[PDB]
Amino acid sequence: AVPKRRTSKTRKNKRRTHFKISVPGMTECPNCGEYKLSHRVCKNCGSY
Amino acid sequence: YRKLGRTSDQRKAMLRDLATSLIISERIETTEARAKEVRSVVEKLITLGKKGDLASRRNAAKTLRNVEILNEDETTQTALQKLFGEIAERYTERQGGYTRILKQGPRRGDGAESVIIELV
Amino acid sequence: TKGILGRKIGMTQVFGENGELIPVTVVEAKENVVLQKKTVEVDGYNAIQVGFEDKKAYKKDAKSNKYANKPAEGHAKKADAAPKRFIREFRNVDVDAYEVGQEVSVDTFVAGDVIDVTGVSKGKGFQGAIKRHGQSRGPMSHGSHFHRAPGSVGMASDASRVFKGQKMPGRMGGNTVTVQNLEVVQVDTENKVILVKGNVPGPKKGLVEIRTSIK
Amino acid sequence: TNHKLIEAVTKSQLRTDLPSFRPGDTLRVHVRIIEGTRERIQVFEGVVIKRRGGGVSETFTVRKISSGVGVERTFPLHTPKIEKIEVKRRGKVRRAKLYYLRSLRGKAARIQEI
Amino acid sequence: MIQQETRLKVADNSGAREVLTIKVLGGSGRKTANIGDVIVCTVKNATPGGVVKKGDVVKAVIVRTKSGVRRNDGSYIKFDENACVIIRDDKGPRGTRIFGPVARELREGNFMKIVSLAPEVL
RNA sequence: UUGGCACCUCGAUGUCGGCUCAUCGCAUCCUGGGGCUGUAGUCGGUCCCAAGGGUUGGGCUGUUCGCCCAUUAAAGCGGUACGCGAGCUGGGUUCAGAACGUCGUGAGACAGUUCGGUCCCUAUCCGUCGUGGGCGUAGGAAAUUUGAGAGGAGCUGUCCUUAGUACGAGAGGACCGGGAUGGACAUACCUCUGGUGUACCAGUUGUCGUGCCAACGGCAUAGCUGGGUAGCUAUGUGUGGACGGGAUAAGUGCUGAAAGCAUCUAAGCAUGAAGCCCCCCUCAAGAUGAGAUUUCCCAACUUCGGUUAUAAGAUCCCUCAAAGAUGAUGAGGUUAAUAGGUUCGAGGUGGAAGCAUGGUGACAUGUGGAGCUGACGAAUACUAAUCGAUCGAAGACUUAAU
Ligand SMILES: CC[C@H]1OC(=O)[C@H](C)[C@@H](OC(=O)NCCCOCCC#Cc2ccc3c(=O)c(C(=O)O)cn(C)c3c2)[C@H](C)[C@@H](O[C@@H]2O[C@H](C)C[C@H](N(C)C)[C@H]2O)[C@](C)(OC)C[C@@H](C)C(=O)[C@H](C)[C@H]2NC(=O)O[C@@]21C
Numbered sequence A: 001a002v003p004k005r006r007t008s009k010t011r012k013n014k015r016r017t018h019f020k021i022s023v024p025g026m027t028e029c030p031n032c033g034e035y036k037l038s039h040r041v042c043k044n045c046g047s048y
Numbered sequence B: 001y002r003k004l005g006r007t008s009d010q011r012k013a014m015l016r017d018l019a020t021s022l023i024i025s026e027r028i029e030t031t032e033a034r035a036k037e038v039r040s041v042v043e044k045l046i047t048l049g050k051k052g053d054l055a056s057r058r059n060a061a062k063t064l065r066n067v068e069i070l071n072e073d074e075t076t077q078t079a080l081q082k083l084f085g086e087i088a089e090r091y092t093e094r095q096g097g098y099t100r101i102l103k104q105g106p107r108r109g110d111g112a113e114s115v116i117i118e119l120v
Numbered sequence C: 001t002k003g004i005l006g007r008k009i010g011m012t013q014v015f016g017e018n019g020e021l022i023p024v025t026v027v028e029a030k031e032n033v034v035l036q037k038k039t040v041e042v043d044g045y046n047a048i049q050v051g052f053e054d055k056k057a058y059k060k061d062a063k064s065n066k067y068a069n070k071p072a073e074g075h076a077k078k079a080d081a082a083p084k085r086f087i088r089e090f091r092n093v094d095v096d097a098y099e100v101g102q103e104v105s106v107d108t109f110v111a112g113d114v115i116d117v118t119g120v121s122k123g124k125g126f127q128g129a130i131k132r133h134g135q136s137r138g139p140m141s142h143g144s145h146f147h148r149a150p151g152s153v154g155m156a157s158d159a160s161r162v163f164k165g166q167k168m169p170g171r172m173g174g175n176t177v178t179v180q181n182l183e184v185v186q187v188d189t190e191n192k193v194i195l196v197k198g199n200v201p202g203p204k205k206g207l208v209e210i211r212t213s214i215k
Numbered sequence D: 001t002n003h004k005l006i007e008a009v010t011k012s013q014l015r016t017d018l019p020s021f022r023p024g025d026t027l028r029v030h031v032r033i034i035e036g037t038r039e040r041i042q043v044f045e046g047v048v049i050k051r052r053g054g055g056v057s058e059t060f061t062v063r064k065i066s067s068g069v070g071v072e073r074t075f076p077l078h079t080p081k082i083e084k085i086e087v088k089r090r091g092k093v094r095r096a097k098l099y100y101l102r103s104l105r106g107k108a109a110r111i112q113e114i
Numbered sequence E: 001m002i003q004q005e006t007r008l009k010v011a012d013n014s015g016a017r018e019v020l021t022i023k024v025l026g027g028s029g030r031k032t033a034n035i036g037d038v039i040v041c042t043v044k045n046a047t048p049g050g051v052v053k054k055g056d057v058v059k060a061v062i063v064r065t066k067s068g069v070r071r072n073d074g075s076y077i078k079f080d081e082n083a084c085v086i087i088r089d090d091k092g093p094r095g096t097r098i099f100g101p102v103a104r105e106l107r108e109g110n111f112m113k114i115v116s117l118a119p120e121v122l
Numbered sequence F: 001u002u003g004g005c006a007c008c009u010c011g012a013u014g015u016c017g018g019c020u021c022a023u024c025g026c027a028u029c030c031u032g033g034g035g036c037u038g039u040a041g042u043c044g045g046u047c048c049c050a051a052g053g054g055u056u057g058g059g060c061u062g063u064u065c066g067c068c069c070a071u072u073a074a075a076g077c078g079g080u081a082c083g084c085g086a087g088c089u090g091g092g093u094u095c096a097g098a099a100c101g102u103c104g105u106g107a108g109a110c111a112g113u114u115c116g117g118u119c120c121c122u123a124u125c126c127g128u129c130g131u132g133g134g135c136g137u138a139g140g141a142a143a144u145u146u147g148a149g150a151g152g153a154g155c156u157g158u159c160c161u162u163a164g165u166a167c168g169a170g171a172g173g174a175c176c177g178g179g180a181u182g183g184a185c186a187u188a189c190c191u192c193u194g195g196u197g198u199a200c201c202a203g204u205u206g207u208c209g210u211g212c213c214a215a216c217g218g219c220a221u222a223g224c225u226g227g228g229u230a231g232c233u234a235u236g237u238g239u240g241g242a243c244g245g246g247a248u249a250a251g252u253g254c255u256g257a258a259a260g261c262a263u264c265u266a267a268g269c270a271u272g273a274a275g276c277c278c279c280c281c282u283c284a285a286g287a288u289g290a291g292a293u294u295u296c297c298c299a300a301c302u303u304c305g306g307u308u309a310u311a312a313g314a315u316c317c318c319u320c321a322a323a324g325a326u327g328a329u330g331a332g333g334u335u336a337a338u339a340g341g342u343u344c345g346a347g348g349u350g351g352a353a354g355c356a357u358g359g360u361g362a363c364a365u366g367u368g369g370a371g372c373u374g375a376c377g378a379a380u381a382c383u384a385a386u387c388g389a390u391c392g393a394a395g396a397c398u399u400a401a402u
């Protein structure tokens, strides 16, 4: 139950290929033109 | 239904307390799951209020907490009285709804999707 | 010989002649339409494709499988039919009898046939070694620490490996299963329902492919 | 229709001539046993213990004492092996299922009429 | 559902007041039995006298288990106690004043002398 | 197996039984085919072909083993570090305590007994069971697919009939085939019988509180107790291993010579098993050989495509569950029943509250199968799926038909 050997830099960088953050679901707000998250209330204006 | 990451007694209590607070304030801020679960409880209480017969009053007394509101001109009346005298009239003609929900962005301390549940 | 696409509604019971509780699965087969007639020289094997249910027609900006897409509208309009929801085909049937564009009707089955119902099982999700595989689990007392896990996965130095097929934890359900030698107790032509003795695979609101026993 | 179809299919097999009763009633049940010779009738007498969901799937239960040995029989209300039913006397209970009679014998299992 | 190490009451005046079972005849690995099934058993309480005496090994056939039996019409017959009757290796009892009811399913198993010498067939 | 040798391992290769899980050989325990017999058939014995499947539950010992009690068609023999402890136990054995018998003057000792005696580890790699993303399949897509291969099953009893027939002084007593039911085991499902059901109904104890009686809430394992819907389930319900082909094994032959006879063999040609292949269930074109059918999409700048953005199609995002660890799958996004609510209903519980009557009271009766009712069925846009955004083709050469 211990690592029998090192994980080389190649293996490391390989495993984390799919480890990333997604760009937010952002759309432009119709009253102010600033971006907002879709289905959420704009925090700059306060609309829909 | 949902469990809200909590036991039964602690949830029963949280749901009824959150419903009472909503009735007091007419719009509150909370996380999505608890809004989604207080929606039904508050909607059903308003139904118990659209009849106003003593049976429904006594039965709705089960859920609401005993709180006092100071209205304008230092007028005082409790949550039951509000439900049955100021909210029954407003929704005498509407046959559902009674509440809306407006998603907001994630909070800072967690990634919880805060929302505002308001009486419509 | 016969085949119909249907969906499962539930189970009830029928008191048949000589007072016998016949457990039954009601199946709703409605507007089954032939959409093609596969042929040996055109496709290499003779069979017919049946479409079941009824989707709505194409609309611009559709966001769900409720409405047909342009590709499917075309396939069904070549059989003058409405877009359908479930499409399967049958090989046991003899193609000359059928015709492109016909309706397959519940009345294809008479009382007392022998049929095979092929559906998909209900999903149980990620399930342990003993519910998925029927394994006897270990002792619950006498100082045991082996309650539900699977036992040895192999031997020792000989086969210093786990062999393929070792019955280990995974996802149960979602498998095509064919129960064989069931029979139909009644066919109702107005509500469009074929009643089948016994029980069939799948969730309620599913899909079953009834055809004539191959045995 | 995708809902009434179950009842629309079982309606042709539902009886109207059966009476209306409730748990706690001692009722005689006529049954058509088909032996090797004929279909001789025979009578079963008991106290209804419970009854379950509607449709062809309603099943009630009766209980009796044969030779000091409790016996309970469960029937579907629409099985066609019942020739006739008689609610021989009414019963004042306060349950819907009467499981608590499996531990009593004699006057302890008493029922008031009406 | 009757398995080995299950104590049953005897329903005869053969001499055994109560017995327990060892096997359920009928198949390798057979584990349970219901009305109409025969087993092997050794009495544990005998009457003073009687033909069968305490500590003997005997065949017997189940009558009126409390798990009860489904009948082909959806009718179920259940009972309030397990019970059994000793047999003479010919489907024939030993006593002749059998007590307690008996199911009607013993008719099929050709336990007819058991069904004929019975207070109530059911 | 008991050994012999001392070749790897003492900077550690946990050793015996049992549990869980098996897997493979066949010198086969049962089942299938046969030659036989000092085989009349049932009986048995012997040998051959056969490994597809199957090959119990207990009492006694730490025991393997063995004996015994009941069964079964049978209760097979072995390999796998005397399979398997980073899967489990720790009874035996092998630490320190103690004690008896024996040996020793003694400290102590005995593979002589006896009671007691800490089983650690968050899985990197290969392996294995599931489940995603990328890319390739000479355009981009939606659906239906053949099957190269691969996996799973594969067991068998009793009764009746033929038939009390053959065969039998008798006693006993089928072969075949043809019916009917089981055991075990695998699957699918909740209609029935049951289990569970911690946001359903009801009764009840102590105590605190909404001033107060009545009503109700909090806590006491969900306080307890009786029920119980959906879901999930077996012990419950169906289903399955049914035929039937093709090639064979031991074996049985036919015609037939070397060797004018014979003779199963050499030519050839027959028959013959739960065995082989197909047949039956499931997965399967990453089957880089990347397959097939139907349909959908089809322009216009180039200054020469190493080209935008768009089709057809999806996704983002959001309401969800017949699906689910997550992601996938599937039902839906206003041109909308996807979920919540509202209305009606099923099922469950069992006679709500307030009244009036009767009782000293504890209570009872009518209103009124009333009241309540989580997932279950239907209708209804009342509330939320409002707005928007991203990705996504323009089809290579060569030769032959054209
Ligand atoms: C809790 C975490 C710690 O783990 C452990 O205690 C576990 C439990 C221990 O398992 C075992 O007991 N055996 C498995 C059980 C076998 O029973 C049969 C009946 C017996 C006995 C016996 C015999 C002699 C003596 C002895 O003579 C004496 C004295 O004092 O003279 C003291 N007694 C007690 C003896 C008792 C580890 C794993 C143990 O290793 C194992 O021992 C074996 C000797 C060899 C094993 N292999 C090489 C084949 C080996 O794998 C060690 C030695 O620990 C004592 C581990 C070492 C590394 C440690 O020290 C670690 C740091 C532990 N210390 C701690 O704090 O964390 C621990 C992890």
Ligand SMILES: [Mg+2]
Residues within 6 Å of the ligand: none
């Ligand atoms: Mg080392």
